[PDB]
Amino acid sequence: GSQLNPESADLRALAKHLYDSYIKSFPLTKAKARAILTGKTTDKSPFVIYDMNSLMMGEDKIKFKHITPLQEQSKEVAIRIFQGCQFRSVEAVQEITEYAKSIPGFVNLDLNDQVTLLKYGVHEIIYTMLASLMNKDGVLISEGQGFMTREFLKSLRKPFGDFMEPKFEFAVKFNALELDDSDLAIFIAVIILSGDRPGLLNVKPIEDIQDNLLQALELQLKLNHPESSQLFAKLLQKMTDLRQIVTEHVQLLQVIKKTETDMSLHPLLQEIYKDLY
Amino acid sequence: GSQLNPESADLRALAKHLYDSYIKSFPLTKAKARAILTGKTTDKSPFVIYDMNSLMMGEDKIKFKHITPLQEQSKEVAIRIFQGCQFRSVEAVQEITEYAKSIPGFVNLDLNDQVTLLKYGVHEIIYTMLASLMNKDGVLISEGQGFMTREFLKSLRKPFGDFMEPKFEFAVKFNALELDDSDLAIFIAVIILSGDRPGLLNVKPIEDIQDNLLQALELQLKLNHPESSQLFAKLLQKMTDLRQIVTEHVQLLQVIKKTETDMSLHPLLQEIYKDLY
Ligand SMILES: COc1ccc2c(-n3c(=O)n(Cc4cccc([C@@]5(C)OC(=O)NC5=O)c4)c4ccccc43)noc2c1
Ligand SMILES: COc1ccc2c(-n3c(=O)n(Cc4cccc([C@@]5(C)OC(=O)NC5=O)c4)c4ccccc43)noc2c1
Taking burial as the number of CB atoms within 10 A of a residue's CB, which of A15, A254, A255, B109 is the most buried? Predict the structure, then answer.
């Protein structure tokens, strides 16, 4: 807290540290994603998926990350897309864990508490980050190479047609807050350091780090958004919305798998892609 | 304790008006509840119900809110307790409604939105307020004249066995924040004015009132708890725990509605449970 206000030095160093770590861990930033979604893409437009024919072409042309399960699982599109999101979600776990280790104090916590914080936090972070690739009309696919429309995802078979809708509804409201990457970098760090996680052995250093992160975010929002009145409080309220998407996703995994006979892929693939959904 | 600034001054006057209305609307405050639970063991001492035998001995001794004149009971302990809590929730709706009308701007809102704010606000408030009446060992009952143990409530017949546990678990963590009646007045007003409720016609006028309630809650907590670093952020995150209790209570009632065909549900609560998520 050396001059400027004061209490604008250790907190500003923490804010900048997280921002740099976030840029390093998550290459597709909100800034880069918005440029594509608004049309400032520098005439390098993403491939649009609006129906089955465009999906078929994108798989051959762009060669998406979800083209792979055309050798282990069924040809059913709705199942391939749903499992593809599951595969990306498990891939994201590693990006989030690398980011978490860069949070001052996180590596010094009890090894079991680190596992617990990442286990319950990753899903809340996935949905927060997913908002950055979404607008009212769709979502950016595979590193911004494609754009899958909201209508196409809604056109999907009986249980799968409603899977992306809760994330779209949240995204529209979360995006109205108009946060940028430097804001998100601190918000995701606050999510990880949640002291109410079940099975936590030593809550004290967790809440101590989170309180320091909350102070850094409160300041970040006041400096970057002076006109957005209670932006900090409004953002904290969105953690209710995040937790609800997570609880609803768990309900869907119960509706499917206990109605879905089309298996869950190769035994080794099933093992790699479990729990982190 | 504003100390200059006409902005801080308006927020203090708002905090003052809300605390005033809360005292007028809710007869059993947290302050009174704590005085009964802790020290002052004279005319304030409650009768303790810890087993089936003590419950029977209690009805004959002190005339509680569950043993009113004429056949209005159920002639079965587990159901009788649950029905009493159901009737108390109806009375609480009248108290919360009275308090809701005192929040500046609430009565000015579209009538349909006034109904939706209360439909969803009610249960989250009952549970927040109920924490004031609890400790880890039990709950104050019949206007603080009695005290029912957590263990006697946990030991009830099969469908009612777990019924109070999510409330007691929430109360333990919520009570750890050490909020007083003056903080609760603002927080419950913040809960009612939730712009993210389903079916709201005009979100913007609700959000504007909530923004001002959040500003008044932030100042209140900083002045009343200056040694409690991020109390405001910790309090806003508890709104997630509130939502989960509601979801479980509703799920619990669906089971009761099927297994207990002869148990009546109040129309007022039936309208509340209706299109609830
Ligand atoms: C940067 O931080 C982030 C940002 C985003 C995600 C994320 N995620 C995501 O992108 N979608 C939308 C989507 C839709 C369709 C196909 C695909 C994929 C898998 O299939 C395809 O062909 N391209 C693909 O990307 C992806 C998700 C949908 C659901 C859950 C997580 C999703 N998981 O983890 C993340 C980390
Ligand atoms: C705004 O402040 C508040 C404060 C509290 C409540 C509240 N509530 C509550 O008090 N309990 C605990 C309890 C336990 C046992 C018996 C009884 C009663 C009803 O039955 C009996 O025999 N004696 C009794 O008091 C009451 C609840 C339990 C469940 C739901 C709501 C409950 N509903 O609404 C409120 C508004």
Answer: A15
